[PDB]
């Protein structure tokens, strides 16, 4: 004696992939005052190694670099389109992969400075509490390890370094890797065959710098550390052009008595997985079915009780943002057209049934003991919308077909 009823606008999301927006102060939409929405009683499984932001930001930086026709990095945001959302894992000890709580929602992201470097992380966002180790396969893999440091270091380039912070940071790093790796930790130069990926590559206002780093990683600082460095000649004793920056993260690689790690290696994208590791792109699915007794910030509700989320929905959502009277650009126009088509498709689904534009309507479709053999109380006052949708997703197509047939046959 339970009847199917249709809700529209419920806070149910799922992992997906889409193209985002530029945001800066090609693609230059102005960014106004932002905001953040906390979430409650929701657990999110994050996996930054399989993220999709990295490829998009790599493509965007390639497009920016090619457009040459001064290039100091500026805080650039990627801002989610209409119909999607950005989820931030704000856990204190979120190593990078796994479940985490205290996940929050943002309309879109914070400032990212596109800076390219290898074997060292420049001007990146600092850690929060402790030294963080990031790796897809820590135990055994020829995959790079990212060490995120809470104590920043200063560098100036001939690079000049203050060896006290380097000694302290190496002590902290080796102690922090001690529990994961039983063998004694020792650091060795890359021992590579060329300087392409075994050196210190970066740029300073149009000048390329290939700076040696073997003195930093060896088997005593003895005061200020001096580093020889070269500039890319275009077809001597130099390297001090007053270029200062901040060292924030290290890239290390393992090797197959004592454990020996080799810095350097990897590609340029892994410099960038270390900045967008907290973030996930998610797609809302504002449609749901539920059994009832009737017969006939848009995401704060998620994580709460079935009924509590059910009663808080309103009509305030006009469609499915901030800037106005500007140039759209190709990417934003594409995203907006896709969003409009998605909304029109959902409206067509509603119109085919008996809701006819209303949010909550009842239909003549009897419930079954095989879609869910759960008590009415269990369904309607103790489980989140997301978990119910995940459990019912197997039979959604059959439910829709039965609903269409019943509406037509009347």
């Amino acid at each position, epitope marked *: 004696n339970l009847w199917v009823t249709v809700y529209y606008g419920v806070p149910v999301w799922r992992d997906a992939d889409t193209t985002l927006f530029c945001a800066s102060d090609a693609c230059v939409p102005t960014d106004p005052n932002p905001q953040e929405i906390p979430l*409650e009683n929701v657990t999110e499984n994050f996996n930054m190694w399989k993220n999709n932001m990295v490829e998009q930001m790599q493509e965007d930086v390639i497009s920016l670099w090619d457009q040459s026709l001064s290039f100091d990095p500026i805080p650039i945001h990627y801002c989610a389109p209409a119909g999607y959302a950005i989820l931030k894992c704000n856990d204190k000890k979120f190593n990078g992969t796994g479940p985490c709580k205290n996940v929050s929602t943002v309309q879109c992201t914070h400032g990212i400075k596109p800076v390219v470097s290898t074997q060292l992380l420049l001007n990146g966002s600092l850690a929060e509490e402790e030294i963080i180790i990031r790796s897809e396969n820590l135990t055994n893999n020829a995959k790079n390890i990212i060490v995120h440091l809470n104590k920043s270091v200063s560098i100036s380039c001939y690079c000049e370094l203050n060896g006290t912070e380097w000694n302290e940071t190496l002590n902290k790093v080796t102690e922090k890797l001690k529990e994961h790796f039983n063998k004694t930790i020792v650091f060795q130069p890359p021992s590579g065959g060329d300087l392409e990926t075994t050196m210190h590559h970066f740029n300073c206002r149009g000048e390329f710098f290939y700076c040696n780093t073997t003195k930093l990683f060896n088997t005593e600082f003895n005061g200020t550390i001096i580093l020889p460095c070269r500039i890319k000649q275009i077809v001597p004793i130099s390297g001090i052009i007053n270029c200062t920056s901040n060292i924030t993260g290290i890239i290390l690689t393992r090797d197959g008595t004592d454990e020996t790690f080799r810095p350097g290696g990897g590609n340029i994208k892994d410099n960038w997985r270390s900045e967008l590791y907290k973030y996930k792109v998610v797609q809302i699915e504002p449609l749901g079915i539920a059994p*009832t007794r009737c017969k006939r910030g848009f995401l704060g509700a998620a994580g709460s*009780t*079935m*009924g*509590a989320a*059910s*009663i808080t929905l309103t009509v305030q959502a006009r469609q499915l943002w901030l800037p106005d009277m500007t140039v759209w650009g190709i990417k934003q126009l594409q995203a907006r057209v896709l969003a409009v088509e998605r909304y029109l498709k959902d409206q067509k689904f509603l119109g085919l049934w008996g809701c006819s534009g209303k949010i909550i309507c009842c239909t003549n479709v009897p419930w079954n003991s095989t879609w869910s053999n759960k008590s009415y*109380e269990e369904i309607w*006052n103790n489980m989140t919308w997301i978990e119910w949708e995940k459990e019912i997703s197997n039979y959604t197509n059959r439910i829709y077909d039965l609903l269409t047939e019943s509406q037509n046959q009347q």
Partner: antibody
Amino acid sequence: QVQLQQWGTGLLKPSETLSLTCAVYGVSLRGYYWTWIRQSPKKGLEWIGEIDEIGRTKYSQSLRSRATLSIDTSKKQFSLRLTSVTAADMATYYCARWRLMMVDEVTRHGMDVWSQGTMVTVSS
Amino acid sequence: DIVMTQSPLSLSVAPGEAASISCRSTQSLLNRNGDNYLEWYLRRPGRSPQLLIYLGSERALGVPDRFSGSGSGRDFTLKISRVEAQDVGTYYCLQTRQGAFTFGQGTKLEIK
């Protein structure tokens, strides 16, 4: 696991305002009806009023004249004041929380979580 | 504004068998679609009363399935399969149909 705590006076002389506050820990206020219940030793339980989370209120016609209800969403609290309490009117013992669901109507399931409650006394 | 009635006023139930509580109103409580706008609560001595039955007859979490409800319109009944140690106390009806609500005089249940 949601819990309710209650602060107030309890001991007051007759014929002034009884103000009592109640806080919730464990869930937000967005999707429920927060209500209270008089508990008289001779009248049992009796419904006094309820408030949503945007401030809309519902009272009882017998106690509408001299009772007021209010919400503070900053710290998830809510309180009441009764003007000119009487010895025979010994009210506002427990806090409460009702459950809700919406299909063409705001239907009302049962109320689940209960505060520890407080004892109110009136002097001579 | 419904005068609400419970029966019997006091109960004396021995362990091992069912116990029945009857509960009546003045104006009909049946909903055109909803099953019933009536609820059943239990209060133990010195404890905050909890939920037993909501919106008709379906129980909620924490029930030992030992309590069940039935009835419609005028007569409502609640039956208990077994009474040993924790369901002794006082049972209350609740009319939630319109306007001012009324619990009504409770029913005391104990053991001989």
